[PDB]
């Protein structure tokens, strides 16, 4: 009933970098976190990381449920040397959406998910800040990129900032993770034409004993 995360950072339990593969649905009243824990495999950070850690520390653990997004006209299998899982891989709970072919236009898409449970749903997504505009063009097509998240009486947009920051280890881009808590019976909507890392599953707090 008390769990030692080791190399897995607590927020990694939500998105699933390879160091967190054995914790994607953990159950624990006390969570032990370690200096060697990392939330990420590709360089980046969680928005409101401190607040979200607070929520998860007293959550009693997490149970994952499918969000049911399906796709066509794009690749859903973006991967990176940074996340090693028998070669290049990605976050286990997320899908790195790419245009069907290099430099091809990414289609404007909209995906929605309704929380049909009685508890609030924790929903994460990533925004990819490519290391270069050529990379962004290569991955999603050229032109302006925009991601919009909406829920009941709420809308917020994110515009990728393609630039080259210090490498980690060799990659100058960043994937930052954003989240929201979806009330029972509310619907989250994502509108995006690229630079969007999509959730495959939502997380529900288990509650303590």
């Amino acid at each position, epitope marked *: 009933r008390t769990v030692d995360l080791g190399q897995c950072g607590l927020l990694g339990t939500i998105t699933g970098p390879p160091q967190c593969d054995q914790f994607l649905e953990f159950s624990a009243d006390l969570i032990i976190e370690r200096r060697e824990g990392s939330d990420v495999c590709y360089p980046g950070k969680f928005v*409101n990381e401190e607040a*979200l850690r607070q929520i998860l*520390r007293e*959550s009693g653990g997490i149970d994952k449920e499918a969000m049911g997004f399906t796709y066509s006209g794009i690749r859903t299998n973006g991967a990176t040397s940074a996340c090693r899982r028998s070669g290049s891989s990605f976050y286990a709970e997320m899908k790195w959406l790419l245009s069907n072919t290099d430099n091809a236009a990414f289609p404007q898409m909209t995906k929605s998910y309704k929380n049909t449970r009685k508890s609030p749903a924790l929903i994460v997504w990533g925004i990819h800040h490519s290391v270069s505009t050529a990379e962004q063009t290569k991955l999603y097509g050229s032109g302006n990129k925009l991601v919009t998240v909406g829920s009941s009486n709420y*809308q917020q947009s994110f515009v990728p900032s393609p630039g080259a920051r210090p490498q980690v280890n060799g990659l100058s881009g960043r994937i930052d993770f*954003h989240w*929201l808590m979806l009330n029972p019976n509310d619907t989250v909507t994502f509108s995006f034409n690229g630079a969007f890392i999509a959730p495959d599953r939502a997380s529900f707090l288990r509650g303590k004993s």
Partner: antibody
Amino acid sequence: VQLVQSGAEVKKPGSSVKVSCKASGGTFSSYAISWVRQAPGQGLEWMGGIIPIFGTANYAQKFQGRVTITADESTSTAYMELSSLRSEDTAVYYCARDPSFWAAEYFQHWGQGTLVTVSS
Amino acid sequence: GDIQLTQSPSSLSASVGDRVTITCRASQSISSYLNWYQQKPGKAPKLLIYAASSLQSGVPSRFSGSGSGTDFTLTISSLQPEDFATYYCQQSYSTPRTFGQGTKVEIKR
């Protein structure tokens, strides 16, 4: 959603105060409650927040475990208790509704405020 | 550590009909996680803009928020008499929540 706070308080240095914030309307469990204070003539200062449906709170470190925020879902009431009061704690204390559960904390509706005067 | 917000100007003189511009600069990049409030003497602040450019329901359309990353602006087009007040930015990106020092918009004469 209306937020109605308890009345003004006068306290001596070193004592403590507990302010109440009662939410009318619907579904206390559908949002978080934050506490923000304002000293006379000064700007705004965030103290912390609570998510009632989870019972979890988040605090500003500057307050050094002097603050305790709690909530009672049966009465749709949140509380802020501030201990070891000092003169600099003299301020109007507000509660506010944060629909984002700390994901993008914003203060969508506010209480009327509670003056707390700390003095000998 | 904490995110510091620097608002400017601190005090502004304006007339009805003016276009008023208030800037907020954050000490690190915070994407679109910035809110704007209005406050008048003796009253709690009131939310105008959340998420840098989303208009709160019921707020007049002359209030426009812009910016992403570190530089943010609140633009009040066509300043109205009920707009003379103090304005605050607040970042929603990190703990602790922090505010700009405020901008007072007063009546020119």
